[PDB]
Design a protein around this ligand. Structure first.
Ligand SMILES: CC1(C)CCN(Cc2ccc(N3CC(=O)NC4(CCN(c5cc(NCc6ccccc6)ncn5)CC4)C3)cn2)CC1
Lengths: 201, 244
């Protein structure tokens, strides 16, 4: 079901086996490098492997998560096959100016699992140039890049916020407003797994 | 404006629209501090790297990867990882490793840890295509996106600039990296023993020892080189006045 869907939850405790399989996963984790972070072990233990059979993972990283994110990516069963960088500009397309250099960019690892078929690889390039909006707010261009890569398929975003909800996406995060599910398969499995509407441990 | 959509529409990469893309006394002190350029033709595969002395404060490592020769002796990450870089690096020192845009972003990190470094910066060379927007890109089999950048990883071991370099994509068959990487490195004021492995006649530079297979001439002499750093000059940053 095409329109945006979301689940307010602690991603550490949600049974994500109820959500089905996804063409694309994206995560912007609160790495342990205001909000609740996850320890390195909690990150490794995330049940990302159940979310896909064949498709792509987009994993935002910074600082030492550049290495930890690669570890997680490989542990969860992905091979890193691209690395998008977002060049941060102001409204006049100047670069907004790690203790050795000033940081002009953010990194999103791209992992592949299985053998995805029917994706439109090569349509976009691996550099985003876009204005910094709010704090820790990722650029909206990533959604269009992902939509051209895999149009119309099911997608899931981990550690998203209300501004991240998108058609074709299910968004998970603990600052979302309740539970809003429209896909009938997901609704059925959610009721069965959570009959009283509560996610505990 | 969505420059990603625009690139899909026109072939102009989003970095084409970045604009604008005194720390000059430091550049002057660097220039006064620099040793004479030194260089050595050496087949690094067959060469005992331990003959390069003394131990270096900075190593710039630029192995010729196969991916550099798209439409054109290449070094695999197997070869590169077996270089004994830790045997010539000083206990406190820095490495700058050109990793390309594919599996090197992972294997280059394996190399850095293997040699005893931790990664502290990831410097991205972003390539514009302002002069040739139409010319598309033949993709790596595993690629999901068109690759328009290369990464230079900075590693540290022991106790003004941005992490981006933006230039026009060079002509096919041109493997040179932007000389701006030398500016970034020298502005760090890391010490004066600087080694560029797999450099060429075209990259030879004051303040650097360049070692590489295609060099046409050599002037390297280990004793002469060491004399540039004997007391009272053992510990200069390369960013201070000469010792009278
Ligand atoms: C492109 C970039 C610039 C984007 C920013 N990145 C870094 C970055 C910054 C900030 C954030 N976030 C900010 C924010 O406010 N919230 C979250 C989303 C909701 N969220 C949780 C957590 C949770 N479990 C743990 C838990 C522990 C303890 C108590 C409760 C819960 N379960 C469910 N949702 C907490 C994080 C997102 C994410 N990444 C760099 C690149």
């Amino acid at each position: 079901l095409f329109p945006p869907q979301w689940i307010c939850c602690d991603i550490r405790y949600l049974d994500v086996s109820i959500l089905g399989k996804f063409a694309v996963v994206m995560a912007d984790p609160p790495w342990d490098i205001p909000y609740g972070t996850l320890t390195d072990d909690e990150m490794r233990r995330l049940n990302i492997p159940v979310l896909q059979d064949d498709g792509f993972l987009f994993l935002w990283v910074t600082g030492r998560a550049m290495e930890l994110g690669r570890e997680c990516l490989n542990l969860w069963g992905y091979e890193r096959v691209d690395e998008i960088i977002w060049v941060k500009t102001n409204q006049l397309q100047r670069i907004i100016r790690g203790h050795w250099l000033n940081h002009g960019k953010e990194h999103c690892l791209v992992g592949v699992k299985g053998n995805p078929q029917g994706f439109n690889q090569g349509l976009d390039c691996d550099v985003i140039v876009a204005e910094v909006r709010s704090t820790s707010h990722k650029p909206d261009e990533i959604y269009g890049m992902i939509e051209r890569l895999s149009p119309g398929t099911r997608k899931i975003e981990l550690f998203g916020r209300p501004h991240n909800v998108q058609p074709n996406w299910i968004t998970l995060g603990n600052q979302l407003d309740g539970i809003h599910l429209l896909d009938p398969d997901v609704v059925a499995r959610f009721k069965q797994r959570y009959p009283d509407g509560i996610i505990s441990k | 404006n969505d420059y990603c959509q625009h690139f899909v529409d026109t072939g102009h990469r989003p970095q084409n629209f970045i604009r604008d893309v005194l720390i000059r006394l430091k550049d002057e002190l660097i220039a006064k501090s620099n040793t004479p350029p030194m260089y050595l033709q050496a087949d690094i595969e067959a060469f005992d790297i331990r003959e390069l002395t003394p131990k270096f404060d900075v190593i710039l490592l630029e192995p010729p990867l196969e991916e550099y020769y798209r439409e054109t002796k290449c070094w695999t990450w197997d070869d590169i990882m077996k270089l004994e870089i830790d045997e010539i690096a000083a206990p406190r020192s820095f490495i700058f490793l050109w990793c390309g845009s594919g599996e090197g972003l992972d294997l280059g990190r394996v190399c850095l840890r293997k040699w005893g470094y931790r990664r502290c910066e990831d410097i991205c060379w972003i390539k514009t295509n302002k002069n040739n927007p139409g010319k598309t890109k033949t993709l790596d089999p595993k690629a999901v996106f068109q690759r328009t950048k290369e990464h230079c990883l900075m590693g540290i071991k022991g106790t003004v600039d941005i992490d981006l370099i933006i230039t026009e994509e060079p002509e096919i068959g041109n493997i040179e990296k932007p000389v701006e990487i030398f500016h970034i490195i020298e502005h760090f004021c890391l010490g004066r023993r600087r080694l560029h492995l797999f450099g060429r006649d075209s990259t030879i530079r004051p303040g650097w020892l360049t070692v590489g297979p295609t060099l046409t001439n050599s002037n390297y002499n280990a004793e002469t080189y060491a004399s540039y750093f004997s007391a009272p000059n053992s510990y200069l940053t390369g960013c201070t006045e000469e010792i009278e």
